[PDB]
């Protein structure tokens, strides 16, 4: 089984903060390559483009202010883009455009920057517990085993992160051990505690 290579392709690209992202272009021979252009559109910014004309041996960058976002090496050898260390500002669209004799081909990446939340769990008052997921990105989801009578804060910071707190009470004395269940893309997490 092998279907034809589609012209436009789009993908969600979740990436952790402070890591080295690398976006690949589709596989292409130099013979088939005329131009190759990374268009990088971050939220509320001018469009940065990085072109490489093979015939004329020209590399041309336009409106590219962030110097972490670069070629992996050189577009005459390697058409991969990298992000030096990922930051929350790098949320945006990244598109490899490839001019060939056959046509034009696009592989796009909807890049999402993940931030691992600081997760805690503590006994608060008489038969209550509080589970925090502090300054993660995106918002984490919190649930309890067993279920109680809980309430949830969402706190949306300007740097893009979100704190999700969940206070929860158990009046019923059928409960002693309580388990917080924090659900996040960076990684799911669980925390048991005796409710002394």
């Amino acid at each position: 089984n092998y279907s034809k290579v589609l012209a436009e392709v789009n993908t969600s690209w979740p990436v952790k903060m402070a890591t080295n992202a690398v976006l690949c272009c589709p596989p292409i021979a130099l013979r088939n390559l005329i131009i190759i252009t990374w268009e990088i559109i971050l939220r509320g910014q001018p469009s940065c483009t990085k072109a490489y004309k093979k015939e004329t041996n020209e590399t041309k960058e336009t409106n590219c202010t962030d110097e972490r976002i670069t070629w992996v090496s050189r577009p005459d050898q390697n058409s991969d883009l990298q992000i030096r260390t990922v930051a929350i500002t790098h949320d945006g669209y990244y598109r490899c455009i490839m001019v060939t004799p056959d046509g034009n081909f696009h592989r796009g990446y909807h890049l999402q920057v993940l931030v691992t939340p600081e997760v805690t769990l503590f006994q608060n008052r008489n038969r209550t517990a509080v589970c925090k997921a502090v300054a993660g990105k995106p918002a984490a989801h919190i649930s309890w085993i067993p279920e109680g009578d809980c309430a949830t804060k969402q706190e949306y910071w300007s740097n893009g992160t979100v704190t999700v707190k969940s206070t929860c009470h158990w009046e019923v004395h059928n409960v002693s051990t309580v388990t917080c269940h924090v659900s996040h893309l960076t990684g799911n997490k669980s925390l048991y505690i005796e409710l002394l």
Partner: antibody, heavy 118, light 112 residues
Framework: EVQLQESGPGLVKPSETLSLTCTVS????????VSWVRQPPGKGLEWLGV???????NYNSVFKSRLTISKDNSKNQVSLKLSSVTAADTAVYYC????????????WGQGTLVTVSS | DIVLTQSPDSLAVSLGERATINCRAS??????????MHWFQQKPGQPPKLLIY???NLESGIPDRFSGSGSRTDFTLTISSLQAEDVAVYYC?????????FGGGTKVEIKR
């Protein structure tokens, strides 16, 4: 299924033009490029030229003076025309579909022997 | 014009034994860390059959005894256990630079 088929005279007199026509089914010529390779008796493979999907062409430099490749998308046909032929041009002529970007030649025609002789 | 050079030009091997065919290129055939060397099988009367595309990738409907390896300028086709039908000529093929070029050919024969 993807198929290719070469038509041709089989015998050609020296210093005349060799005309062949690859006829294709299973795919459109608007999407896929097509190449011509030849194979002289008991010798290796030699690329002649490509008819890119877009309509442009490249030719092997040693054949570039004599060789012409054209196509007709509505007929699903690719022509080859090699002028000023000699005994050296005696060979089996294959047409073969290139897949885009990589230039891998996945499907081939059965071939057609062309003998240059008076 | 990249010059592909297969080695050996023919080998004889007993039935069931391994069979390795090398192909070295005069220049690199790589771009973006992808090697554009491809392997063909041709039997008398028939056109070339694609075994292996971009260096290591196995084609649909080809036995898994056929395998491919290498990068840059040095590549290898390996038949893990040679069968009676595998007697053929084998060709390497670069597609990275214009013009595409083919290897000289390697004839494989069974000893019995």
């Amino acid at each position: 299924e993807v198929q290719l088929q070469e038509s041709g005279p089989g015998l050609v007199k020296p210093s005349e033009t060799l005309s062949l026509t690859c006829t294709v089914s299973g795919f459109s010529l608007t999407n896929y490029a097509v190449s011509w390779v030849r194979q002289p008796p008991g010798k290796g493979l030699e690329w002649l030229g490509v008819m890119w999907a877009g309509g442009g062409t490249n030719y092997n430099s040693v054949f570039k003076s004599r060789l012409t490749i054209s196509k007709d998308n509505s007929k699903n046909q690719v022509s080859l025309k090699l002028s000023s032929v000699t005994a050296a041009d005696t060979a089996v002529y294959y047409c073969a579909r290139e897949r885009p970007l990589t230039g891998v030649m996945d499907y081939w025609g059965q071939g057609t022997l062309v003998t240059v002789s008076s | 014009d990249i010059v592909l050079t297969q080695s050996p030009d023919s080998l004889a091997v007993s039935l069931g034994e391994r069979a390795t065919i090398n192909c070295r290129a005069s220049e690199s055939v790589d771009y973006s860390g992808n090697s554009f060397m491809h392997w063909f099988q041709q039997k008398p009367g028939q056109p070339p059959k694609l075994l292996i595309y971009r260096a290591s990738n196995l084609e649909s409907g080809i036995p898994d005894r056929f395998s491919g390896s290498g990068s840059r300028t040095d590549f290898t086709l390996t038949i893990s256990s040679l069968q009676a039908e595998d007697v053929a000529v084998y060709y390497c093929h670069q597609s990275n630079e214009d013009p595409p070029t083919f290897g000289g050919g390697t004839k494989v024969e069974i000893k019995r």
